[PDB]
Structure formats: C-alpha cells, structure tokens
Amino acid sequence: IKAICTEAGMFAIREERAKVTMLDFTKAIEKVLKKTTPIPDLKGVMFV
Amino acid sequence: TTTVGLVCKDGVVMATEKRATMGNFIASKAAKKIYQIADRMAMTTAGSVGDAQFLARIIKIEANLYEIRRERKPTVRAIATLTSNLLNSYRYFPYLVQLLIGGIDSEGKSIYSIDPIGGAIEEKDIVATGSGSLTAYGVLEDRFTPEIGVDEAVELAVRAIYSAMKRDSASGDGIDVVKITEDEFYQYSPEEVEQILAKFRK
Amino acid sequence: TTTVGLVCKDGVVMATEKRATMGNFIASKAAKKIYQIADRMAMTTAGSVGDAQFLARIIKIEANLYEIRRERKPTVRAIATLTSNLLNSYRYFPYLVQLLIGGIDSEGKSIYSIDPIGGAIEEKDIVATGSGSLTAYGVLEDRFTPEIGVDEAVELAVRAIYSAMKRDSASGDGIDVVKITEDEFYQYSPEEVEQILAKFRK
Amino acid sequence: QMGYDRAITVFSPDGRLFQVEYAREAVKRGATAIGIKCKEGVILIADKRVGSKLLEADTIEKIYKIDEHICAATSGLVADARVLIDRARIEAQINRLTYDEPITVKELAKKICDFKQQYTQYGGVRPFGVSLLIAGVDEVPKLYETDPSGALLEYKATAIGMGRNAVTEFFEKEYRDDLSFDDAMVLGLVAMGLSIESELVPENIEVGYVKVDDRTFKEVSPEELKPYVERANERIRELLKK
Amino acid sequence: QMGYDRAITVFSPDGRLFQVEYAREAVKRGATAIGIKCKEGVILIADKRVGSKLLEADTIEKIYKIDEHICAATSGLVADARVLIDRARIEAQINRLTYDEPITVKELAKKICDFKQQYTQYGGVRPFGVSLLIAGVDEVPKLYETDPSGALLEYKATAIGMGRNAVTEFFEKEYRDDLSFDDAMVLGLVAMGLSIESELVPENIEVGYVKVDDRTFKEVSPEELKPYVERANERIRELLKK
Amino acid sequence: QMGYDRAITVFSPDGRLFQVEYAREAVKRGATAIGIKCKEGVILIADKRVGSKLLEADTIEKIYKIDEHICAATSGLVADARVLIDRARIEAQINRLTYDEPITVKELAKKICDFKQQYTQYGGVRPFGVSLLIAGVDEVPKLYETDPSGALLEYKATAIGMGRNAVTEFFEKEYRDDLSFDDAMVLGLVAMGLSIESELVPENIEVGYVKVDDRTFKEVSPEELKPYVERANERIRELLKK
Amino acid sequence: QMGYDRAITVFSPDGRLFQVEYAREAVKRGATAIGIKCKEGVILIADKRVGSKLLEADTIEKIYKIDEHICAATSGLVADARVLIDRARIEAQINRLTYDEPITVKELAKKICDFKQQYTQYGGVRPFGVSLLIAGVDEVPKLYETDPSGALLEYKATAIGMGRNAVTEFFEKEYRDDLSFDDAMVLGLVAMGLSIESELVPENIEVGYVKVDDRTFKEVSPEELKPYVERANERIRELLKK
Amino acid sequence: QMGYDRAITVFSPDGRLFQVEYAREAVKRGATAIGIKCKEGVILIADKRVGSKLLEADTIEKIYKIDEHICAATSGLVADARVLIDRARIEAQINRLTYDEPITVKELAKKICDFKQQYTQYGGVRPFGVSLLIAGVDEVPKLYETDPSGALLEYKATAIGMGRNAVTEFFEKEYRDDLSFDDAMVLGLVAMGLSIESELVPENIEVGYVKVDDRTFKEVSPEELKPYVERANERIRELLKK
C-alpha cells in the first residue's frame, strides 16, 4: 500500500499537481503490478 | 396361439389367450403371455411360451431405465425398435416369439408388430398375428370404426380368439383382455372375459 | 415378392408390393417394404420383411452420418457399396434379402441392384428384382423410353407389378409406388395406386 | 511446485483435481462462442475471425452439425473438438438407430458428459480441455454447457472462451427470458462484437440456429446474416465509444 | 511432504491415504444436500440453487431418481455425480432383471459403494470425489450416506456438502424420531437455510420423498412446495437474527 | 527420506515392507473389535457406540454373517472390509458348491489370505487395510486373525482396532483355557469396557457367537445381552479405578 | 513448464500443453514446404535440397501421393511422416472400399487429424511430431494444414517449417486472389527462393499439384520445371538486393 | 539436458529429441561400415577387425544376407542387430510370399524404419539403436542408411560407425559418378583403412557386393580379396604419410 501511494504520487508529479486523483491510483495499481509479472501469450494455432 | 390389437378413440385394447395348448400338453392355466411393459404400455405374445417370458422381462427393465434417463415418459416407437434390435443382436440366443407392442403415449396411438426374426413395422389401427390371425383380421374389421368405445372393443377382441379356438383342437378356453384407456390399465382376466363369451354361449 | 425400378430423366421411380404371402398365410395387415433413406434416396425390398427392416434402419442412420461428414449428401453408389459390406459382415446372421438402392446424385439418376452375397451393379435402364421379376421385365422393357418422365414411370411401374401379382400366388396386394421428382420424396400410398390398377382391369 | 497437477489421479489438499481446472483454462484462451436461448428457438454464434487472410475466410468450422436438430459450438483445443465432435455425432446417430427417435438435447448432454468423465477418472490418459455448447430444439428449446470434466450446467445464455466475461455482465443487464427470435439474435451479435472488441463482419462469424416451428438446424448464410449485423453494428460502435 | 499422496498405492505414515482424505473434502466444496428420516417415510432434500442469473434456475437437478422407490442426492463434483448415478440406476434395475424383487435400500448403497472401493484400490484411476445420500423405503425407511472411499454409514438424519458442519449442530437439539412427515420436511428446509444463510424460494430447490404407504418415489412441484417453504422461512428468519 | 515407504514394491534394507506396516496402522484407526474363543463356542464382540445420535443404533454393526457357522468382525477401512467380508461369503459358498462340505474355517482364512496376497504382490494395486477376525465352528471352535498382509495367525483371544494394546495385556492375565461359555461371554465384555474406557449397555455392542452344539451363527438380543453386561460391569468399575 | 512438460498427460497453468508446443518446434527443425491455392488448382512445392553431395536427391523429398487426386507434403520427423502418410493412403483407400468413391480432401484431412489426436491423448505414446499440408481437388481446390496436436485449419496460401515465418511475410504482401495457375506457380517458387536465401535450380526442388480441369494429380517432370524456376530467379535476385 | 533424455516420449524444448540423438551417438560409438554405389552395383564393406587373437577370425558376422540381392552391414549396438536383421529377413521373404517378387530396397528400408518408429513413439519400448546400410539391386543399385531414428536416406556413397566423419570428408573429394566396380570396392577399402588408421589384410575386413550383371548378392572370399587388398594398401600408406 505504501508502494501504491508513492507510485500514484509519481503520476501526480508528472502532470504537475499536488493532489492525487482517482485516476492516478488506478494507474499505479496497473504500473507496479505489470512490471512484476507479465500478461502476453498466446492463442492457437491449435488452442483456438 | 393368436393375439389381437385394435385402436379405440379413447383407449387402445389388445388381447391374449391365457391358456395356451400344444398337442395334448397344458403348461399352466395361469400362464402369463400378457405383459405389462409400463403404466400404459402392454405387450401380447403369440408364439412360444418360455422365450416370451424371458425376453419380456428385459423389456420391462428398459421401460423404467429410459423413463429415468429422459425425465419423460418413454415412447412406443422407442420400445418397438428396441425389441427388434435385441432380437437381431441375439440370434446366437434367438427368441422365437412374435410380439405385439402397443399402447398409449405422448406420441398417441399405434400398434407395432415385431417379427420373430426382428424388425419393427407399424400397423395403421388393426393388427393380428399368429395362427388365428387370418380369420381374425375380418372378425375385427366388421365392427371396427375409429370411434368405437373401449367396452365394445373388448367384446370385439374376444370374438377373434373365439374364432380360432373352434377350428383348432389345441387352443385354450382361458383368455385375457387388456384395456389401456389412459386412465386405467385394467386386466379383465379369465372370469370377466368368460361371461362375454357365454353370450356367445360356449 | 417383387420390386421394380426404372431410371427416368427427371428422377427415379421404383415400386414395391406390401403384404408377404407364403401361400395363403400372411403374417400381418401390412408390412413396410418401402424405406425413405433420404429426400432423394430410396430403398425398395423384396425378400423377408424382418431382415429388410433390420438392415434399413442401419443404412438410414449411416447415411446421416456421411452427410455430415462430407457436408455433401451421399451418392447412390456409396449407399450400394455400404450395403454390400454390411451384408457380408453379417453373413453369420442368416439374412437373405434382395435390394434395390436408388436415387439421384450429382452424377445423374441411377439404381444399383444388390444380392445378399455382395455386389452393386449399374442399371440406367430397367431393373426388376424378386420371384415375379421375369414377367415384370416383359412389361417394362418394351414400354421403356429413356425419354420417359417420372410421371409416365408411375403409370408403367403399376402395370408391371400388377401383371406379376397375376402370375404368382405368393404376392399379396398392397401395391405402393414411390416417386422421387427431385424436389421431394413422394409416397403415393396403397389407395391411390389401387385406382390405377382398376383402370388396368374392370 | 505442486505435484497435484502432475496428474489427474492426484487431488490437491484443497479437495480439487488440480489438473482439471487446468484443462478448464484451455477453453478460455481459445476464441469465443455464444449460445442464446429464447422461446422462439435457439441461436448459436461462433468465431471466424481467426488467422488473417492467408487463411480461408470461410475456414471450417466452429458450428458442427451433430444431428439435423442439434448443433454445437466449441472453445478449447479444436484437436480435441475434432475427435469429441466425431464421437458426439456418432453417439447421437446410435440413439436414432436403436430407438428411431431424435435424441433430446439433455439426454445427449449426459452421454457426452459420461464420455468426458471416462478420461477424467483414468490416470493414464489426459482429459479433454475443451468445452462444448450443445444448443437444439428437441421439442422445446434447450441449451447446455458441457464442462471439460464432463459436467452438465443448463444456462439461460452462455458464452465460453475469451469473451465469456464481457458477455456475462452484458447479458446480466439486457437479456430477458421473453425475447423475440429477432431480438435475441441481434443482441447476441451485439454481444459477439464486444467480445472481440471490434465491429462484426459476416466473414468473421459463422451463425447457426435451431427454430421451434422448423425443428431444423439451419446455418445463416453470410449475406442473409448481413442485415442482422448491420443493425447490430450500431450498438457495438455506441458501446465502444465509451 | 508429508504425502505419500501422489498415488493411492502409497499409504501415508499416519495410516490414512491422503488421496481419499482430500476427496472427502471435495464433497464439502460441492453443493449441500440434506437428508431427514421419519417413520411415515424418509424425505430427501437437495439444493438446486447454484449459479445466479447466468445459470438457469433449474440446473440438473440435484436429486436424482435412482430406482422407482429409491432416490439419492449428490454433493461433490457435478462431473463425478453424472457417471456414478448412471451405474447406480443400471444396478438397481439389473436386480429386478435377475430376481424380479425390489433391491433393498441397504444393499443398493452397498453396490454403489463397491464401485468406488474399486477406485480406491486400483492406482490407474482416482476415486470419485462425491457423496451420494441414499434415501428410500424398502418397507421401513432407511437413510444412508456413501463416502469417497466407498465407506458406508447408516444415518437417520444427515447433511453432506457445504452444510456438513452446520446441520449436525442444528439436529443435535432439533432432531427427534417422533417428528411427523410435515414437521420433519420443514425441519429439513430450515437446515439448508442455515447452510446457505438465506430464506428459500420453492423455485430453486428440488424435494423428493419415498413414503411408506406408497413405497414409491414422488416429487414435489414448486406449487405444492410453497406452504412448506413458508413455514420454514419463519424459523430461518429466527436464525439470522443471530 | 526413503523410497522404501514410497513404493509397495520395495523392501527396505531392514527387510520390511512399510506400506504393509502403514496398512497395518490403517487397522488401528478403526474402532475396537475383540474376539474371545472358548471351548464352548467362539465370541466376537464389536463397537456399536460409533457415531452420534443422528446415526442409527444399528450403525455398523460389524459382525457380518459369512456362512451358516461363520461370522467375522472387522477393524480398518469400512470400505475395504465389505469386499473382503463379501468375498468371504462367496468363498464359503464355493466350498459348499464344489465339495458339499461345511466351510473349514482354517481353509476359508487361507483362501482370504491368498486373495489378499494378490493385492500385496502386485504394485499397480494396493492390499486392503482391514484385519478380520475369522471365526466359526467347522468341527471345533476356532478363532484366527487375518492381517492386512494376508497372514494366518491363530488366536484364542485377540483384539483389533484402537482398543488392541489394552486388551492384549488384559487376556495375558485373565484369559484361561479352563473356560465356560457364560464366563467367556462375561470376560470379553469386561475387556470391551476397558477399551471404550466406559461402561457397557446392550445398545453399544453387537455380539455374535457360534455355538458348537448348534453350529450356527446367532446374534445376541439386547434383552439377552443385558444380564451379561451387568456381570461384566463389576470388573470394568474396579479396573478403571486405580 | 519445469515439471509440467515431462509427459503429455499434463496441462500447464497457462492452459497450453507444453509437450504439444515442443512437438510443434520439432516441425520448425525440419525444412519448409509451401502450398498455394488458386482458383484453377492447388500447388505443392517441396524442398528436396541435399545437405551433402553424397546423398541422392530423391529421399529428403516431401511429396507423397496419397490418392489419384490428393498429394501432401510434410515437415517434422521424416520417420513419423512416412508412417503418417502410409496411414493416409490406407484411410483414403478405405473410403473407396466401402463407398466406391475417392475421398474428399476435406474428409481425408478430418480422418488423419483424428488419427493424430489419439497419439496426443495416450500417455503411452508421444504425438506425431509432424505438421502436414494436404492439397487436393475433390471437385474444387482445397488446401488444409494439420498441426501436430491433430487440429484442422483451412488455408488458401500457406507454409510450414523454418522458412514459414518468411513465407507468411511474403504472402502477406504479395499474395492476392487474382492469380492464375501460372502466376501462382511462380509465386511459390519465389517463396521457396526467399526462405533458402539463394537461387534455385530444379534438382533441389520438386513440384506436385492437383488441377480441377484434369482433376488429377500430376508431378512436374524436371523438363517442365526449368521455365518456372527461370522466371522465379529473376525475382529471387531482387530480394537478395534488398 | 536432463529430463528430455529420461524418456523417448519427451520432445525437448528445441524440437530435437536428445534420446534419439544419443542413439545416433550409439551408432558412432561402434565399428565402421561403408557403402559405395556405382552404376554396375553397390558394394558393401564392413570392419572385421577383432579385439584379440582369442576371438575366431570371422566373428559372427558383419554382413548379413537379407534377400537374394539385398545385404546389410552394421555399425552401432551388435545386440540390437540380431533382432532387427532377423525381422528384415522375414519381411524380405513376406513380399516374396505375397507378390512372388523380390523386395525393393525402398520397401525393405521402409518396413524397417516404420517398425523403428513404432518403438520410438511408444514409451514402454525403446527403439533399436543400430544403423544398417542396406544395399541391393532393383532396376538400379541402391544404397540406403537406416538410421536409429527411423529415417531413411539414399546415398551415392556413405559411412557410419566411428570412422563416419573421416569417410564423409574423403568421398567428397574422391567420389565421382564414373567409378568402376572394382575401383569402387578398392575405394571403399581405402576408406576403411583411413578409419581405423591401420593397413588392411583380408583378415580384418569383410566385403560382399551386389552385382547388377548377376542381379544377386555374392560374398567375396579372402583369397579373392587378396589383389584388391594390396592395391588399396599403397594408397592407405600415402594417406598416413599425409
């Protein structure tokens, strides 16, 4: 939770704002998580 | 040995000899050759006694089994096919018995004959099968209309087995009439049938 | 028993006689010997009733299966060869039936004739098959036209069978004709055909 | 690691056959297909988007005839579909032989469920990792979903595969049990668009149906499917703006 | 480790087979079912509420007619249920084939039990992770429960599935052998009602029974079901104040 | 740790099958069962305090009829027990079939031992975790124990199940060979009461016995049990005191 | 994937079966083979190139006659392919036996998929580690691809093997449906030229085809080959100047 | 890599099978066998060199007769050879049985690689791990290498065994398609001498040959090897001065 709030804080900074909005948090949940375990792969071929 | 079947408007009526004779030998004077297959299905067998019973039991077992698996009442058309399939597959154990399956179902009324050599044919609203059949077809057809009630049908049914019995020296005086009226499944049994033919005197 | 066939330029018309007679003994009121295999395919049997009924059901069921498979209705030829192989596999069950398998496909109109030792053979003319067949050929062959419709084939198919009936006491009465106009599977049924033979006698 | 997904015979401590929830995931990754049950019939819509245009644009098939009154559509391995459908089509034709009766959608469902449960129970042979939709009209419209483990679940409307999740929420709101044939069809086509996140084209959908009054299976032809699509694209676009 | 649990051919060091011990909990993962016995017959109640709007309100079923005078419930895998009850039904009808006699309530559950015992000893196959409750009247009512091992225990009121813990505590106080058919039926509905934490609706639960007068299986339409559900629901409201 | 308890095909270098010794410990998690042999009959006493109040009085009920002079109790998997007890009935009636001789107990136990050794030798399957007490009067009263392994042992008092260790010690003191039917029957009841740590009543045992003179299985009735219970409780009370 | 790739009985947590994905990689070990369908016939070009000049270039060949109007090419094991295609001759012949009909290319593809699928299910056996290109004319041109799983994909310009990646790229850009038999012939020689990344000569490559006007299989003699390659060469040089 | 060489059923991540590659390593491990084809025949030479002078000079044997004009010679496990060539002989006779025709080197090669592949497929059997160079005259001389994989390849001239690479690099330079019969067998003695790196005597090589002009397999005696043996030696000495 500390990492979400710091990371959300990174979006707010970029966009030049003091306040953290709703969009920034959900963006931080997506950001942090994505870089830790992956999403691509795969569709058939043979699994279709 | 002979068996009859006719389609009533409000029912279906079929009949069996309840005493079967061959030579001077009588096996039983309470021998079943009339089979209750399900609640409003019946089977009447002409041909051999023993093979009748043995085949006939398995067909009961099927009626239940199918009804449970389908969540519905079985059809006549299912079981009509089935007997014949069983009979063709076990021609190493052949059952040399001539069946008549008929009755009432969701599909409606119809009477199928199954040959002792397999195969399921449909008869329009009359059927006879056996030794006494040749005469019997005409006996029924005299008073057969499609709007004949159940009561007149049973009268009518007796007269065909009655026809056979005098010609041959080796038929029974026992008789069972089966009524299938979709409200009862009544088995008239020798006594009740007897007095129908005591109008016919003998 | 006798069945007749002729190959028309607008379909296939084949005909059968129901009722199977030993000499004066019939086994039932009527007896299916006309099978609808598909809306363009027919099977007309001369032989035993039971053996034909057993095999016919089978044939119908694998016809449907092959349709799905190729997504492409079975040929007259394919049914014929299927049938030869089914009869030789089951040559250990005593089935003696002579078959006429016919219809319409993309290669034309044809009938292939089957004997119960195997075999399918091309006819694009006249084919007739059974115990009444020799007399039957007298009618068919002369009055053959290969410029004959399916509508003059029915007039002819009656006359051939009618003549066979009057020269065998092992044929019954129950004449059905089947007609395959390439748009349907028409069965005339006993009644209508009876009237065509009334104007071929008194 | 686990050793409970080594084989089917091994349950996890969780009281789960871990290897059959993994056969389940096999369905999800493949392309989507939707059955939509109304009282005027049943509708079956299934993928043809697959590949590019180096493939046939009429690549075959997701919409298998089983009988002339019963159809099915699939997700999962279409290897496992090819054999499973072969067995289904034969299983149905056996019923017609030995009873001369069309098999009922429900009774068919039990027999293929039993077939799948044979490989599920045995350890020396892997289960199927394919789901089956069986939609037909036997004498009322009926729709089942057959699970990879041989389980039977009856649905009001269902989809399986990739787009399942999008459909679940969408139908949760709009679908009614009292829909028209026209309505239900157009709507499941709206739903099929959302599933693949694009407009339809009739070359990217194969669509079949079994009607109540016809009692027959018929596959809707690409340009006879085109006006339906045409009224469906409006809605799909409306919902992809947001 | 521990287990000694990757096969059934290996006993764990505790004298158990973990494989069978995980399969007994696979019942608890499954849907609840409730059995209750009285002396005017034995009522068997099964939860037909599974899913929500996406699933049909009639999901099959879960309370199968096994014989004419015998029914059984299922809990555990839907998939395993499907095959077990096919065999069970075959065996019940096979007894009449060879004897022409009603199969005993006690003996039919035994021969269901033997099939799974088979699957406990051969390693090539897993045991079924399913429990049937076997309810009937042979000529006095009898209630049994079948276990994933093939273990057989005579019950007089029981729960299985989700409701396993709940209903036992509930029946400690409530249950008695002089309840009437009606008081017992109603007591069965409350007991499922604690299991799920909710008031019941006769439309999403299926109830069957074999009475003693009839000795024939019957099934309760949701229309007949209404008054019972009504009497049941008052007590369920009383539960869910705590 | 070792592959030696991880297969049933592998002897340890200790020259022991640990799988068979963990099948061994499958018996001990079954409820107690005791056998007493007297010169006047042979007596099998078995728990029926098993279960809750939601469980029948006559709930297992271990002392199944095998023949017309042969009963057998069990401890272990109640599943695996039913098949061995069933196989015991067939083997006995086979003896009756092929010779027309009353089933020698000794040979029946031998024939169960060979049947159980098919499952011990083979590794694709597993040997039953049940100990049976084979007892009956063929010509003189006899009592044996047949093991999970399928090994023949002669006993004249023994116990099997969780009560075992207590009862071995009790008979090492008490058991005698100058022993009368009533005394025996009292004595073994004494022993059962130590096992359950609590007083007996005729509703928490079943006792079967096979007389010499009669040469038949008979179950003792609860009313008939009662005097034997009363006499036995005197010693139970003394020995559960210090 | 790490312990879920040691057999074929496994499903992985991805929903993929990694043992089947490793079999697909077996195919890319071998060389490219390419098929084209145009409206006048279907075209099969196999690589026949030798890896040493001590071989004879007539056994690394891919083209096999299967019926008088169905040929097919291969990539994968050589070993597996020869058995796979001796089966496909027998299946095709077996259809002629019972129907008197040469096998539709669509049906033949469905049969041999179903054969390959049984080698995937069994854990006693590995799949066929091959993909095929089945090219035929039934009445109108058809071209289908088998995957090593036994899945079926209809194609219309295609390849398998190593050079597959480049041939896909090639037909993405170049291939249109307005091409003649000659014009499609040249494009498949150009697609083979891209993938080996050098100029061809007609002794390292073999062409078979099926036309619709002749409705037969023919094999292009080396004599008839030179002009197609001579045109191709003109265009293979241009891609070696990119 | 471990676990992709612990089974024959396990395809590796690369598409290679390291088991089968290790069976080819088995073929290189053994003794050498060289096959040479010319237009007048195909001459097959095999190492007859022994470990000791305690072994009978002819060790049974290095060149089998399979048909009347078909021989093969061996490299790899000599164990596997016994059964594999036995099987090969029965097959060459079977074709004479059922067509009354001598089998062709394609079709004998074909049977034997199909038979190989079947035991590569199964995981319950491991394949033969020996390679034979089958030589014979059909309409033309033919020389085939049957690989332990189950692959056939036709050669102009070839080698297998430990000396394989040496004799492939040699024939690349020397081999031409003009070589005489006598100069062919000599050229294969030169090859043979290179592999072992020792000079030849007729007591450490075995030559048979297949003549077109006789159309029969013949076995060359040491006596009738002697001129060829000296001639080849002059050249063998020169290669070991290089």
Swiss-Prot record, chain A:
Belongs to the AAA ATPase family. It is found in: Cytoplasm. Homohexamer. The hexameric complex has a two-ring architecture resembling a top hat that caps the 20S proteasome core at one or both ends. Upon ATP-binding, the C-terminus of PAN interacts with the alpha-rings of the proteasome core by binding to the intersubunit pockets. It comes from the Archaea. Consists of three main regions, an N-terminal coiled-coil domain that may assist in substrate recognition, an interdomain involved in PAN hexamerization, and a C-terminal ATPase domain of the AAA type. This is Proteasome-activating nucleotidase. Residues 46-48 are annotated as: Docks into pockets in the proteasome alpha-ring to cause gate opening. ATPase which is responsible for recognizing, binding, unfolding and translocation of substrate proteins into the archaeal 20S proteasome core particle. Is essential for opening the gate of the 20S proteasome via an interaction with its C-terminus, thereby allowing substrate entry and access to the site of proteolysis. Thus, the C-termini of the proteasomal ATPase function like a 'key in a lock' to induce gate opening and therefore regulate proteolysis.
UniProtKB/Swiss-Prot annotation, chains B, C:
The keyword Hydrolase applies. It comes from the Archaea. The formation of the proteasomal ATPase PAN-20S proteasome complex, via the docking of the C-termini of PAN into the intersubunit pockets in the alpha-rings, triggers opening of the gate for substrate entry. Interconversion between the open-gate and close-gate conformations leads to a dynamic regulation of the 20S proteasome proteolysis activity. GO terms for cellular component: cytoplasm; proteasome core complex, beta-subunit complex. Keywords: Autocatalytic cleavage, Cytoplasm, Hydrolase, Protease, Proteasome, Threonine protease, Zymogen. The keyword Cytoplasm applies. PROSITE patterns: PROTEASOME_BETA_1 (PS00854), PROTEASOME_BETA_2 (PS51476). Its EC number is 3.4.25.1. It catalyses: Cleavage of peptide bonds with very broad specificity. InterPro entries: Ntn_hydrolases_N, Pept_T1A_Psome_bsu_arc, Pept_T1A_subB, Proteasome_bsu_CS, Proteasome_sua/b, Proteasome_suB-type. CDD domains: proteasome_beta_archeal (cd03764). It is an enzyme of class 3 (hydrolase). It is found in: Cytoplasm. The active site is at T1. GO terms for molecular function: threonine-type endopeptidase activity. GO terms for biological process: proteasomal protein catabolic process. Component of the proteasome core, a large protease complex with broad specificity involved in protein degradation. Belongs to the peptidase T1B family. The 20S proteasome core is composed of 14 alpha and 14 beta subunits that assemble into four stacked heptameric rings, resulting in a barrel-shaped structure. The two inner rings, each composed of seven catalytic beta subunits, are sandwiched by two outer rings, each composed of seven alpha subunits. The catalytic chamber with the active sites is on the inside of the barrel. Has probably a gated structure, the ends of the cylinder being occluded by the N-termini of the alpha-subunits. Is likely capped at one or both ends by the proteasome regulatory ATPase, PAN. This is Proteasome subunit beta.
From Swiss-Prot, chains D, E, F, G, H:
It is found in: Cytoplasm. The keyword Cytoplasm applies. GO terms for molecular function: threonine-type endopeptidase activity. The formation of the proteasomal ATPase PAN-20S proteasome complex, via the docking of the C-termini of PAN into the intersubunit pockets in the alpha-rings, triggers opening of the gate for substrate entry. Interconversion between the open-gate and close-gate conformations leads to a dynamic regulation of the 20S proteasome proteolysis activity. SUPFAM superfamilies: N-terminal nucleophile aminohydrolases (Ntn hydrolases) (SSF56235). GO terms for biological process: proteasomal protein catabolic process; ubiquitin-dependent protein catabolic process. GO terms for cellular component: cytoplasm; proteasome core complex, alpha-subunit complex. PROSITE patterns: PROTEASOME_ALPHA_1 (PS00388), PROTEASOME_ALPHA_2 (PS51475). Pfam families: Proteasome, Proteasome_A_N. SMART domains: Proteasome_A_N. CDD domains: proteasome_alpha_archeal. Keywords: Cytoplasm, Proteasome. Component of the proteasome core, a large protease complex with broad specificity involved in protein degradation. Belongs to the peptidase T1A family. The 20S proteasome core is composed of 14 alpha and 14 beta subunits that assemble into four stacked heptameric rings, resulting in a barrel-shaped structure. The two inner rings, each composed of seven catalytic beta subunits, are sandwiched by two outer rings, each composed of seven alpha subunits. The catalytic chamber with the active sites is on the inside of the barrel. Has probably a gated structure, the ends of the cylinder being occluded by the N-termini of the alpha-subunits. Is likely capped at one or both ends by the proteasome regulatory ATPase, PAN. PANTHER family: PROTEASOME SUBUNIT ALPHA/BETA. This is Proteasome subunit alpha. It comes from Archaeoglobus fulgidus (strain ATCC 49558 / DSM 4304 / JCM 9628 / NBRC 100126 / VC-16). The gene is psmA.
